[PDB]
Design a protein around this ligand. Structure first.
Ligand SMILES: [N+]
Ligand SMILES: [N+]
Ligand SMILES: [N+]
Ligand SMILES: [N+]
Ligand SMILES: [N+]
Ligand SMILES: [N+]
Ligand SMILES: [N+]
Ligand SMILES: [N+]
Length: 121
């Protein structure tokens, strides 16, 4: 939502940038250090993500336009994707969050073009 985008742009060094914020409002998140931290911030603020517990797959399922329990294959597929990214070995917390969310890119893009289950318990 608008509020979280604005607050995260202030919380993250470099993120209060006109050009970057045009991307963010368009659900476009480039692979750069500022955006890494921005994506982490949004994930934390919306409780979609946690540095320790990773991606809340149920919260993300709900953020993809659903109100029910996540499909089992959605949970399985993303648990496996996230495990394959060896997130615990990524020292930079922003890079870690950005890498984690790459697993859900296809889902968010499909949802956008149409309009707890922590991965690391
Ligand atoms: N900022
Ligand atoms: N700022
Ligand atoms: N962040
Ligand atoms: N959550
Ligand atoms: N399911
Ligand atoms: N991981
Ligand atoms: N999806
Ligand atoms: N939660």
């Amino acid at each position: 939502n608008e509020s979280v985008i604005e607050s995260c742009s202030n919380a993250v060094q470099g993120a209060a940038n006109d050009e970057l914020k045009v991307h963010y409002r368009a659900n476009e998140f480039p692979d750069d250090p500022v955006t890494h931290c921005f994506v982490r911030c949004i994930g934390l603020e919306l409780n979609l993500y946690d540095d320790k517990y990773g991606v809340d797959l149920q919260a993300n399922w709900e953020n993809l336009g659903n109100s029910d329990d996540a499909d089992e294959e959605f949970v399985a597929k993303h648990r496996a994707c996230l495990e394959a990214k060896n997130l615990e070995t990524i020292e930079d917390l922003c890079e870690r969050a950005y890498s984690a969310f790459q697993c859900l890119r296809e889902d968010y893009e499909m949802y956008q073009n149409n309009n707890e289950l922590w991965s690391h318990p």
